[PDB]
């Protein structure tokens, strides 16, 4: 339960002004993880880091649109 | 540069005419539109 989370830290994978891919990657990372953790022996609490980062970084409308498209079956990223 | 004397010299009176006519041709139409701006904005 390692937290003390304030906001998303600097990520050397995404060091420049354009942070779009950082939001996208953590959104994928969280949802890939949350799917994996529905296998036998899994709890979504392990996915929490990705969840906090994407929620911190991603515009609400991006999250909402992506969620809608995952439910429609039209999300274009691989989960 | 050197030049022949004016074939058709333009007196100061003639210049004042041409200048006034020139200035009026710029100022009057624009003046009319700008004066009536409020007559336009209300339509």
């Amino acid at each position: 339960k390692i937290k003390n989370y304030q906001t998303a830290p600097f990520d050397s994978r995404f060091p420049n002004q354009n942070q779009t891919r950082n939001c996208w990657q953590n959104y994928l990372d969280f949802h890939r993880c949350e799917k994996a953790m529905t296998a036998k022996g899994g709890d979504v609490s392990v996915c929490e880091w990705y969840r906090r980062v994407y929620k911190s970084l991603c515009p609400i409308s991006w999250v909402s649109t992506w969620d809608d498209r995952r439910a429609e079956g039209t999300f274009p990223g691989k989960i | 540069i050197t030049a022949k004397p004016a074939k058709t010299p333009t007196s100061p009176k003639e210049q004042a005419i041409g200048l006034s006519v020139t200035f009026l041709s710029f100022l009057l139409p624009a003046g009319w539109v700008l004066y009536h701006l409020d007559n336009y904005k209300k339509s």
Binding site: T20, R21, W24, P76, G77, K78 | -
Partner: protein, 259 residues
């Protein structure tokens, strides 16, 4: 009279009718896109074709029939055609830039990958490879035509040029068929956009180039070219090699690397 070798051109109406044709085509496109009507566009296309036909007819009259293309005049036309081709290269460069910009940094809407999710590219080893062999082969045949002309051989110039034109037509019909069979469309995001606008402008240049070669074919049938003076043929060959090189860049970039 003059004692220089340059061409003082008779006053001509075709610049004005060309410029008006441009007004009619562009206002015609506007009316097509926004006011559901093809009328102006059809007039403009017609006057454009009329303008080109009469203007280049007059250039033939001035040169083959009146003798105004001295070597100095020809040299000028060589520069003019090279410069025109350079401007056309830069035009295509803008479309390649758009292609690499989109494909090297695919956005999340695409799936963050290239080709985008949902896009199923043509196999570059099928019709695209055939098209490549077609245009490469027509670069060989037009070079045979050029040498035959220089060597004074009318029959083989006409055969080689006929083969060149036939290959250009084959490319065009193959590309028309591929457009119809393609499972993706110009409205299929930036993949479809870059694919069809870039290959579409190229296809337009193939049709332009083929038409130019057909003009040369008929002028050759009419004995206009000498074994030494035939700049319309040289310009059409330069333009044809340009069309072949653009295709190679399209093939490697969009069809092959981008697949």
């Amino acid at each position: 009279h003059q004692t220089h070798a340059y061409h003082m051109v008779n006053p001509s109406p075709w610049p004005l009718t060309g410029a008006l044709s441009a007004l009619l085509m562009t206002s015609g496109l506007t009316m097509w896109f926004h006011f559901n009507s093809m009328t102006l566009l059809m007039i403009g296309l017609t006057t454009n074709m009329l303008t080109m036909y009469q203007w280049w007819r007059d250039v033939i009259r001035e040169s083959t029939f009146q003798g105004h293309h001295t070597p100095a005049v020809q040299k000028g036309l060589r520069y003019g055609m090279i410069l025109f081709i350079i401007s056309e290269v830069l035009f295509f460069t803008g479309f390649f830039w758009a292609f690499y910009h989109s494909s090297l940094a695919p956005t999340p809407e695409l799936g963050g990958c290239w080709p985008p999710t949902g896009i199923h590219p043509l196999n570059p080893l099928e019709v695209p490879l055939l098209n490549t062999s077609v245009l490469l082969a027509s670069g060989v045949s037009i070079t045979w035509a050029h040498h035959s002309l220089m060597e004074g051989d009318r029959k083989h110039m006409l055969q080689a040029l006929f083969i060149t034109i036939t290959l250009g037509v084959y490319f065009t019909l193959l590309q028309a068929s591929e457009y119809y069979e393609a499972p993706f469309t110009i409205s299929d995001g930036v993949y479809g956009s870059t694919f069809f606008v870039a290959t579409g402008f190229h296809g337009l240049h193939v049709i332009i180039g083929s038409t130019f070669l057909i003009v040369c074919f008929f002028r050759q049938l009419k004995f206009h070219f000498t074994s030494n003076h035939h700049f319309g043929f040289e310009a059409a060959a330069w333009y044809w090699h340009f069309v072949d090189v653009v295709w190679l860049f399209l093939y490697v970039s969009i069809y092959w690397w981008g697949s």
